[PDB]
Design a protein around this ligand. Sequence first.
Ligand SMILES: Cc1ncc(C[n+]2csc(CCO)c2C)c(N)n1
Length: 333
Amino acid sequence: NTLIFNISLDHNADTSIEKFFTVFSKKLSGKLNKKINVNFNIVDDSFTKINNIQANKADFAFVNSQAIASNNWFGYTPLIQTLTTAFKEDLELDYYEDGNLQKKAEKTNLLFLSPPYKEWDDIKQKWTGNRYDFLYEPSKLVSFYRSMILITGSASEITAIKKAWNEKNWNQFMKFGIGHGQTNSASRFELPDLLFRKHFAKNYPGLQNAINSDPDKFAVVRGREIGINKNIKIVFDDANSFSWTQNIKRPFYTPIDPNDRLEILTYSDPLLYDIGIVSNNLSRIYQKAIGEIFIELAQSSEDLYGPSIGYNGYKMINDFEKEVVEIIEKTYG
Ligand SMILES: Cc1ncc(C[n+]2csc(CCO)c2C)c(N)n1
């Protein structure tokens, strides 16, 4: 018997990926009293992964939490919630109506600016091979993440960007240039979009409508490349992306003027971290076994894949509605 997983590689996962599956296979064969070999295909996009499983081309994969449902007819079942190590200034899940999104960003700025990213060192900033450990609370796992909005520019520009924000003047704000991702990206499009609807009120048309209405004021820009394109001084990213983006001696997260600033304006509402889904072509017993093997590797610190992509733990999902859907509903409505 043989299974097929879909897997994404980040950092140096590829150097240990084969052994991880040799291990996984071993443990799965033990649990199931059978010789079972687990192969993998490398796949990046959640919708391809989901489509593969629904097409009986794959048995298991981790996918964006907002891309799935728990539905008897879908051909897969949500199996495990991935967990990630909390960031220091964000141990607790909360929303815009809790007032802490901007203030959490401010606290994080304190840790992040001095020293500046470009001077970060593997030893001083405690690079683990996957992340700069000085930004995390290793004794704490959480099941959520957020988007963040980075801003950059001269000292007076940064003051004008913040001014526009606090006054809730959308047209003034957008005129600084906004860098985004694909329209189906939570961190680089949807979460920022939702945050604006909550923050800006009437004057907000929605992000896509704004882009159509004034294309020159928007562009696709990665957070790590902010400042590179003048004309775009506001950029969306996964919250605290610099934490797992290794500074290697232009530098990332670094303006093209040493006098210019770069900081986090605010965070977005939260979303659940990725979820492992499993094919319904497998018996419930096989499904649970797969899930347990992940949980157990994490508990024994023998998981050599998870951490490479921010999966520092796992837990079983027992009530998807309560544990997933109701959480997502507070962010998306
Ligand atoms: C160590 C590490 N931490 C976080 C990420 C980014 N990431 C991986 S899965 C996920 C949630 C769904 O987007 C995010 C933000 C990474 N690549 N590596």
